[PDB]
Each structure stands twice: as C-alpha cells, then as structure tokens.
Amino acid sequence: ADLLLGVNIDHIATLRNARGTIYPDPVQAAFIAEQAGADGITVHLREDRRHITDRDVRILRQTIQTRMNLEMAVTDEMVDIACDIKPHFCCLVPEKRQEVTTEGGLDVAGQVDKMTLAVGRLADVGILVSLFIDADFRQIDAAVAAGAPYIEIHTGAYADASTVLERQAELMRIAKAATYAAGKGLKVNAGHGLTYHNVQPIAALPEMHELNIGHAIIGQAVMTGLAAAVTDMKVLMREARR
Amino acid sequence: ADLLLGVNIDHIATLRNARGTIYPDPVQAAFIAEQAGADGITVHLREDRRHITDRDVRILRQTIQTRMNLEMAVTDEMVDIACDIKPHFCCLVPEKRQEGGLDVAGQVDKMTLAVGRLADVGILVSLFIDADFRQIDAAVAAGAPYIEIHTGAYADASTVLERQAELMRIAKAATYAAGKGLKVNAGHGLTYHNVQPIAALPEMHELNIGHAIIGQAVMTGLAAAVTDMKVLMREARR
Numbered sequence: 156a157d158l159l160l161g162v163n164i165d166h167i168a169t170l171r172n173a174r175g176t177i178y179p180d181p182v183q184a185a186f187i188a189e190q191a192g193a194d195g196i197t198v199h200l201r202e203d204r205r206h207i208t209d210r211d212v213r214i215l216r217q218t219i220q221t222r223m224n225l226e227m228a229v230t231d232e233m234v235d236i237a238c239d240i241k242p243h244f245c246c247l248v249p250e251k252r253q254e255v256t257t258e259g260g261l262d263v264a265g266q267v268d269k270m271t272l273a274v275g276r277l278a279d280v281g282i283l284v285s286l287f288i289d290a291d292f293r294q295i296d297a298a299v300a301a302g303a304p305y306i307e308i309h310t311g312a313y314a315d316a317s318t319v320l321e322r323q324a325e326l327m328r329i330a331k332a333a334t335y336a337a338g339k340g341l342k343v344n345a346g347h348g349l350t351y352h353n354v355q356p357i358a359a360l361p362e363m364h365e366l367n368i369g370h371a372i373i374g375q376a377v378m379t380g381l382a383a384a385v386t387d388m389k390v391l392m393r394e395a396r397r
Numbered sequence: 398a399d400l401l402l403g404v405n406i407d408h409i410a411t412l413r414n415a416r417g418t419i420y421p422d423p424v425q426a427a428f429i430a431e432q433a434g435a436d437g438i439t440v441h442l443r444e445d446r447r448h449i450t451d452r453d454v455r456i457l458r459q460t461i462q463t464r465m466n467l468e469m470a471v472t473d474e475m476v477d478i479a480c481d482i483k484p485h486f487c488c489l490v491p492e493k494r495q496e497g498g499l500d501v502a503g504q505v506d507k508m509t510l511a512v513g514r515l516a517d518v519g520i521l522v523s524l525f526i527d528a529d530f531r532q533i534d535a536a537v538a539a540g541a542p543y544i545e546i547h548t549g550a551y552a553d554a555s556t557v558l559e560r561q562a563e564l565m566r567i568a569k570a571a572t573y574a575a576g577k578g579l580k581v582n583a584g585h586g587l588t589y590h591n592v593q594p595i596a597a598l599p600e601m602h603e604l605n606i607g608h609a610i611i612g613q614a615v616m617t618g619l620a621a622a623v624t625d626m627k628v629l630m631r632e633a634r635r
C-alpha cells in the first residue's frame with residue numbers, strides 16, 4: 156500500500172530532438188529521478204522515434220537502477236526489441252487509429268488474439284505486461300483473457316473534466332474499474348494527465364499499485380529542476396494515503 | 398568590458414505545445430531568467446507558431462522587466478505585429494527557403510524597407526547573418542544598428558582546426574563590423590562548454606542563448622542554469 160511512482164522521461168527527449176544535440180539526455184534524467192524518489196522509469200519508444208530513441212532504450216536498460224518500464228505499440232518490431240532488452244515492465248499502448256478506442260485506451264477487446272500472443276512472447280522472456288486501458292469492464296475482461304498480469308487505467312477523462320460533477324463521475328469510473336480489475340486478480344496502475352493538482356484523489360485509491368506520470372513532472376522540472384519535481388510528486392502521493 | 402546575456406525562452410514552449418497544456422509557461426521562465434542574471438528575453442514568433450504563440454508575446458510584453466527581443470522573419474504580418482507590440486529589439490532571421498544567416502546582400506532593398514519601418518516606431522533592429530564581410534556591409538547599407546553573428550558552424554566544428562577556423566572568422570567579423578559602427582551580437586549553438594571563446598571577443602555586445610540553457614534547466618532548474626551561464630560570460634572577459 157505504498158503507492159509507487161513511475162517517472163516517464165519522454166519529454167526530456169522531446170527537448171533534445173528539437174535540435175540534433177546530445178543534451179538533455181534522458182539517461183541523466185533517469186538517475187536524477189530515481190534518486191529523488193522514483194520507483195521506476197518509463198519510456199515510450201514510438202515507431203517514429205519522435206522522442207525516445209533505440210539509443211536511449213539500450214543505454215537506459217543498462218543504467219536504470221530501479222525497474223524499467225517500456226511503453227510500446229503492439230507490433231512485431233516492438234515485441235522483438237522488448238524481448239531483446241527485457242525491461243522489467245512493458246506497457247502496451249495504442250499509436251494507430253485502428254488500435255485505439257474513442258477514449259484513448261488500447262482496444263484490447265477488438266484484438267484479443269493479437270494481444271494474447273504479444274503478451275505470451277513478452278512473458279516467456281520474464282517481462283511483466285500491462286495494457287493501458289480505459290476504465291471499462293469489457294476492456295478489463297479482455298486483458299485478463301489476454302493473460303496480462305497488469306493494467307494501467309487511462310486517467311485522461313479524469314484530468315480534462317471541466318466541472319465538479321464531471322470530475323466526480325470520471326473519478327468514480329476509475330474507482331469502480333480499479334475495484335473490478337483487482338477482483339479479477341489484476342495489479343492496477345494509472346496514468347495520463349496526472350499533475351501536482353489532481354494526483355491525490357487517484358493516489359488515494361487502495362488498489363492503485365503504481366502511478367505513471369511524465370509531462371507534469373518534466374514541466375515542473377524546467378523551472379525547479381527534476382530532483383525537486385520528482386520529490387514533490389512523491390510527497391503528494393505519500394500524503395494522499397494518510 | 399560588459400557582456401549582456403539574452404535568454405531565448407522558445408523551448409520552454411517546445412515543452413508545453415507537445416501537449417495542449419498551460420505549463421510550462423514562457424511567462425514564468427522570463428521572470429526566472431531575468432532574475433538569475435539574463436539582461437533581456439528573446440522569443441521567436443514563427444509564422445507557424447510552433448513554440449511561442451501571440452498569447453505568449455502579448456503577456457510577455459506586459460511582464461518582462463528587462464527588455465524584449467522579438468525574433469521574426471521579414472514578412473508584412475510580422476512587421477505589423479512588431480509595430481503593435483513594440484519590443485526594445487527586433488532580430489530579423491531567415492525562416493523560409495528564400496531567406497545560415499539572413500541574405501541581406503542578396504535582398505538589400507527589402508531589408509532596407511523592413512529595417513526602416515521597424516526603426517520608425519523606435520525599434521532597435523538586428524540582422525542575423527553569417528560572419529561575412531559582404532553581409533556585414535549589406536547590413537550597414539540597410540541601416541540596421543545591430544548584427545547578430547551566427548555561431549552555428551563554430552558550435553558544430555568537429556575538429557580543432559575547424560573550430561579555430563570558425564572562431565577566427567567570427568573574431569574577424571566582429572572586429573570588422575565594430576569597425577563599421579555596428580553593435581555586434583552573437584548566437585546559435587552556444588553552450589557552457591563553447592561560450593567562453595565567443596564571450597572573450599572584445600567586440601561582443603550581447604549573446605543570445607536558448608536551447609543549451611533550457612537543456613540544462615530540466616536537469617538543474619532554470620535559475621541555476623541562467624546564473625551559471627552568466628558566470629561563464631563574466632569569467633571570459635577577465
């Protein structure tokens with residue numbers, strides 16, 4: 156019931172790729188973040204490599220002193236890289252139109268067989284697999300039949316809610332989905348759009364295992380530095396579960 | 398003696414526009430930078446607004462406590478905007494394939510019209526150019542009181558001979574331009590590791606530095622990043 160913090164460092168790479176320079180280097184961030192209270196490091200290797208690159212992935216795997224979480228699209232190219240690099244975690248996410256739901260989560264249920272097989276290959280090599288899904292009982296069932304030990308619930312709707320009633324409903328949607336996922340024996344993560352100002356209610360949920368969080372941290376980091384930004388998110392998360 | 402630092406806060410916005418968010422906000426980066434030793438704030442308003450927006454310029458205009466330097470291409474729309482906003486400086490810069498530094502010599506009449514309109518509403522105008530004597534003269538011909546010498550090639554020198562050769566080209570251009578009455582700025586590609594030879598050149602009025610500053614910032618914080626860059630610049634002129 157200590158909630159874990161995964162720091163996603165893609166946007167360090169966004170800043171880098173904007174020029175073709177060597178800095179800022181995601182590898183440096185990983186060290187800052189872990190020693191400031193991150194429990195894991197996340198990177199999304201996109202097919203287009205718009206931020207994180209193969210160069211990044213291959214070095215991070217040798218330098219992450221915690222657990223590495225590799226977010227990737229469900230493709231044969233990416234399942235190969237994953238089965239080579241062997242991160243502690245994989246998190247399967249959509250990147251194409253045909254793989255995503257209206258809401259932004261991975262369509263596990265529309266492509267069950269593709270999922271099961273991807274999972275199978277990752278697991279056979281010791282990786283633990285998460286599917287980033289909506290707070291949806293049907294997608295949850297799919298992930299179980301997929302054999303994915305973990306899910307990550309998409310906190311976007313929860314983040315973007317304009318009004319008090321909307322926020323409440325989205326929150327209850329996540330709450331119920333976490334309770335259900337766990338019932339069916341899934342370990343439950345959450346992420347997308349979490350900030351220094353909306354994290355607590357998500358943090359407070361008993362079932363949440365790890366929160367995955369990138370942009371807000373990187374965004375605070377340019378002003379105050381990543382060590383401060385990570386510690387402050389970790390503090391809010393601790394306080395949320397008092 | 399004294400060397401000014403203009404901090405280009407463009408890539409704060411690179412970070413924000415990636416998502417649809419409000420943070421990180423260039424408005425804040427400006428207070429931080431100004432207060433940790435920047436002497437001016439530079440932003441480049443692209444026609445494509447891929448980083449800095451009009452919202453940004455509008456607010457900055459009212460929040461900046463030092464002086465604003467607006468980087469822009471030579472278009473009717475951009476000159477109109479800069480006539481409204483009235484920054485202390487304007488830096489003219491290539492953006493399209495038809496505009497390396499600006500080709501002032503190739504387009505001296507256009508640059509003269511543009512320099513003219515900006516300077517008629519009190520703007521100090523700077524032309525961003527290669528360290529080329531010819532472009533320096535075209536600048537003087539167009540009326541611009543400032544040049545900024547492009548330091549890209551220097552920053553990219555991959556061999557020691559290439560580096561010295563780019564450094565002297567910059568040194569000689571600064572010397573010559575100052576010998577034609579220009580105020581000489583420099584910029585593009587300056588880091589904590591290559592700034593001092595440029596800082597060292599007696600002619601330099603202001604260094605305009607962005608990316609390397611934002612790049613260090615996400616690690617160490619904006620304030621320290623700005624301050625350390627300032628120190629390097631002071632130490633260079635000892």
Ligand code: PXP
Binds near residue numbers: 371
């Ligand atoms: C599955 C998942 N979780 C978390 C995040 C990070 O969300 P944010 O950057 O909005 O905190 C992302 C974005 O890469 C993601 O794809």
Ligand code: PXP
Binds near residue numbers: 405490525586
């Ligand atoms: C005219 C000019 N000067 C200076 C800079 C700063 O260059 P850097 O961000 O590489 O320090 C830029 C980049 O926007 C520029 O366009």
